[PDB]
Structure formats: C-alpha cells, structure tokens
C-alpha cells in the first residue's frame, strides 16, 4: 500500500512516527499545509519532520494520481474532493464529536456554548464539510476552566490515539461506517469568530463572560484583552453591583472587576512573565502569592519554557518540588523536546552542585528521554566532553 498523510502539527507527526515504527512495506508520502513554512512552534512543523525523516513531500495534485493508496487528512487545510481519486480510501480526523461542531474553531465553540463534553471523530471524506460517514469517535468531558488551548491539546492527543487504534483496519479495509445523523448536526464557519477583532460581550451574565474569556484563551494566538489589560482567567464574585453590565468597578495592576447582568466578575491580569522570572530564584511561598490562578503554573512561553523549566535551568530546587506537588510534569519539555533533566544538567554543569539530582530522580526525573534531534542528556555530555558529570549522572537508575 501507499499511505498519504496530509496535514500538520503533532497529530500528523506522531501518527507518522507510529507508522514508521510499526508498519514497514508501507510507502509513505506527505502533503503539507500552506502555512507550514518549516517552523516548530507550540506544535512541530510536519514539513520539517518529513524532510528530516526522508518522507517524500508531494502536492495535493500529485496525491490525486497515486493508485493503490490510502489518503489520511490530519488537520489538513485544503478541500478534498473524493471524485478526484480512483478509490474511496479517504479519511479525516475532525476535532469534534460529529455530527455536532462541523467546521471551524472547535476549540472555542463548545466552550462558548457551555458544553459538558466534546470529542474527536474519524470519518470518510465526502464532498462536503465534515459530513462523511463515521468510522470511529471518542468523547471526553470539558473541565470547568477548560480553555481553547487546553481543549486543543486534548484533541491533538485523542486524535492521535484514535488514528493509531484504527489504522490497521483502514489499511486492511476491515472497518464499519455509519452515516451521520441530521439531528444535533451543527456547523460554524470562518466568519463565526473574528480573531483579529475579538470582542467580549459584557452585556451578559458572569458565567457567559467567563466562558467567552476561557474560549478565547490560547496564549500562542492571543489572550482576551479588556480595557487594555490581557486577562488570564478569573472568578465570579458574590457581590452584585447595581451599575450597568460592563461597568468597571475596580482596575489595578492585578485585576479588573466588572459589573455584569447578575454577579460581579473578577478578571485576573496576565502575569505570566512575572511568574517565569520568579521561578529563577524565589520561594514556593513567594510564587503562591504572586499567582492569581494555579493554571498559570502550566503555561509556556513562545519557546516552550514553563515554570518548571525555568526552576530547573536555575537549579531552584524548592520550586521544582513544589510545582511537581501541584501536578506539573517533572519531565516537561520545551518545543524542541528539550527536557527538565537537560535544563537541570546545565545548572549542575554551570554551578558544580550535583547534590539535588537524587531528589529529582526519586520524584521521577527521566534521564533517558530524547529531544527532537534524537539526543539524550548523555549524548550532550559526551559531545561536550563533560565526562565527570556524565559519570555522576550515570550511577542513577
């Protein structure tokens, strides 16, 4: 068989990796999205990956003429018409529990509409928008403080899994379909949200305002901004101003308080930059007071730097352990795949203090992971001839 993987991001990358590890005899090809210019971001560039792993990249046009192929769209950006192929072995992963939420912005809309869950759906491509028969789908609940970013990461992940579970069946042809019901079918278009002129409607209830805030929270693209302040989460108060919804009751460095249709809301200014800086050398105590929401402890900057990555690079041992106690991953990575252990090794090197490593190993620090270049911490130390640190790190299980 030939297998054509058209799309982008960690879903296209991780499915392709699994195929490589698991299916030989398959002849792989890649079609990439138009805005994929080779740059890794909060997601990997699938184009860069394919070039490095020698997966031939072809045009959508070339894809039409391949016979004895399977075509699989993973967040692909161009319309695929099944009449342009000799076969009907054409599949898509859609980021919703179809028939609901066909179309665009499916990381926002379920939140805006205050859904209790969402899902991912594997289905056949037909001529229209997310309309072809369903092969498989899985659902999952939305968290109370779900954001568009957290939702999107759940899609990437569940999408990847649902594809890998179904791949053998698509390749063999031994899978079932069910036509999508008309009932409960919904669709949003490109025009349904203007991200370049985002307005929060403040003539709304506290809950509705917060749902809009959280729907529009996706740091790599934007934070919601109100009265010139970037907002990162908030809360519903018990007070109820008599003033008109939208009235600013309080504005300072820390927060905005607004009158709504029902209960006043408190909206936290974003202090993520201040948090990262604090993680360099302040105590867990200092950080717990600086933060307004514990969600900020799992945020990452444009490089993929999280609080734990800062604490590790600066050898701030108390903050590392505290963050872990709040459910932060001790083996967190930046966007190049560089791990906590890699950062903490740098601190060991620069400082000459090796005494903290044991603690971290005990907390589950993994020395054997590899970055996106396929190198471990050991490959780095060998390469840079840091042999005494290599050997000290090598004693640990």
Residues at the site binding Na ion, with contacts judged by CB under 5 A = 135, 176, 190, 385
Closest residue by Cα to residue 335 from 300, 367, 303: 303
Stretch that binds ligand FON, among 77-85, 228-236, 337-345, 349-357 (CB under 6 A): 77-85
Q: Around Cβ 56, how many Cβ atoms within 10 Å?
A: 11
Among 108, 158, 381, 393, binds Cl ion (CB under 5 A): 381
Q: Is residue 73 involved in binding ligand FON (CB under 6 A)?
A: yes
User: Nearer to Na ion by C-beta: 190 or 326?
Assistant: 190
Positions 225 through 254 that interact with a copy of itself (CB under 8 A)? 236, 240, 242
Q: Is residue 103 involved in binding a copy of itself (CB under 8 A)?
A: yes
Among 128, 141, 168, 364, binds a copy of itself (CB under 8 A): 128
Binding site for ligand T3F (CB under 6 A): 75-77, 104-108, 148, 152, 195, 218, 221-222, 303, 305, 309-310, 313, 334, 336, 338, 342-343, 346, 380
Q: Give the x-and-dash track for 332-371 against Cl ion (CB under 5 A).
A: ----------------------------------------
Stretch that binds ligand FON, among 19-27, 122-130, 315-323, 382-390 (CB under 6 A): 122-130
* Smallest separation (angstroms) from ligand T3F to the CB of 342: 5
Among 92, 96, 212, 306, binds ligand FON (CB under 6 A): 92
Strand partners, 79: none
Q: Is residue 189 involved in binding ligand FON (CB under 6 A)?
A: yes
* Smallest separation (angstroms) from K ion to the CB of 28: 33
- Does an H or E element contain 64, and which? helix 60-64
User: Cα 334 to chain center, whole Å?
Assistant: 12
For residue 351, cis peptide bond before it (omega within 30 degrees of 0): no
Q: Is residue 261 involved in binding a copy of itself (CB under 8 A)?
A: yes
d(CA 67, CA 87) in angstroms, rounded, equals: 8
User: Nearer to K ion by C-beta: 241 or 376?
Assistant: 241
51 vs 3, 59, 76, CA distance in Å? Answer: 17, 14, 18
Positions 154 through 213 that interact with K ion (CB under 5 A)? none
- Order across the sheet with 225-226: list the strands: 225-226, 229-236, 265-269, 255-258, 248-251
Task: Annotate 357-372 with b (16+ C-beta within 10 A) or e (fewer).
Answer: beebbeeebebebebb
Q: Is residue 259 involved in binding K ion (CB under 5 A)?
A: yes
d(CA 304, CA 325) in angstroms, rounded, equals: 21
* Smallest separation (angstroms) from ligand FON to the CB of 120: 12
Phi, psi angles (nearest 5°) of residue 52:
-65, -30
Task: Annotate 162-195 with b (16+ C-beta within 10 A) or e (fewer).
Answer: bbeebbeebbeeeeeeeebeeeeeebbeeeebee
Angle value at C-alpha 31, between 28 and 176, nearest 5 degrees: 65
Partner touching 84 among a copy of itself, ligand T3F, ligand FON, none, CB below 5 to 8 Å by kind: none
Sites of contact with ligand FON (CB under 6 A): 73, 76-80, 92, 104, 125, 127, 129-130, 189-191
């Amino acid at each position: 068989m030939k297998l054509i993987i058209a799309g982008k991001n960690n879903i296209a990358v991780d499915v392709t990796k699994w195929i490589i590890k698991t299916i030989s005899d398959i002849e792989l090809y890649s079609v990439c999205n138009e805005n994929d210019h080779g740059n890794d971001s909060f997601q990997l560039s699938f184009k860069k990956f394919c070039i490095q792993f020698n997966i031939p990249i072809i045009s959508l046009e070339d894809a039409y003429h391949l016979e004895d192929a399977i075509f699989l769209s993973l967040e692909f950006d161009k319309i695929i018409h099944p009449s342009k192929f000799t076969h009907n072995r054409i599949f898509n992963i859609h980021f919703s529990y179809l028939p609901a939420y066909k179309g665009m912005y499916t990381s926002a809309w379920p939140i805006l509409n205050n859904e209790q869950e969402s899902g991912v759906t594997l289905h056949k491509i037909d001529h229209g928008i997310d309309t072809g028969a369903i092969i498989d789908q899985q659902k999952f609940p939305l968290d109370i403080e779900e954001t568009a970013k957290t939702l999107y990461l759940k899609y990437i992940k569940i999408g990847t899994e649902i594809v890998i579970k179904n791949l053998p069946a698509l390749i063999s042809g031994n899978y079932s379909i069910v036509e999508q019901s008309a009932i409960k079918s919904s669709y949003y278009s490109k025009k349904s949200i203007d991200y370049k002129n985002l307005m929060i409607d403040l003539n709304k209830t506290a809950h509705e305002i917060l749902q809009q805030i959280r729907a529009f929270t996706f740091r790599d693209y934007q934070l919601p901004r109100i009265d010139d302040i970037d907002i990162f989460h908030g809360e519903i108060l018990s007070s109820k101003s008599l003033s008109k919804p939208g009235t600013i009751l309080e504005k300072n460095n820390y927060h905005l308080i607004l009158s709504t249709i029902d209960y006043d809301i408190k909206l936290y200014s974003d202090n993520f930059d201040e948090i990262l800086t604090a993680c360099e050398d302040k105590s867990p105590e200092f950080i717990s007071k600086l933060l307004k929401t514990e969600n900020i402890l799992f945020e990452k900057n444009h490089l993929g730097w999280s609080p734990i990555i800062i604490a590790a690079y600066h050898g701030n041992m108390d903050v590392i352990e505290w963050l872990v106690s709040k459910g932060v991953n001790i083996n967190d990575r930046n966007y190049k795949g560089t791990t906590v252990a890699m950062y903490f090794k740098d601190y060991m090197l620069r400082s000459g203090n090796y005494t903290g490593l044991e603690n971290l190993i005990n907390l589950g620090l993994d020395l054997f992971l590899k970055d996106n270049e396929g190198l471990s911490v050991f490959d780095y130390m060998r390469k840079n001839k840091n042999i005494e640190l290599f050997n000290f790190m090598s004693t640990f299980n």
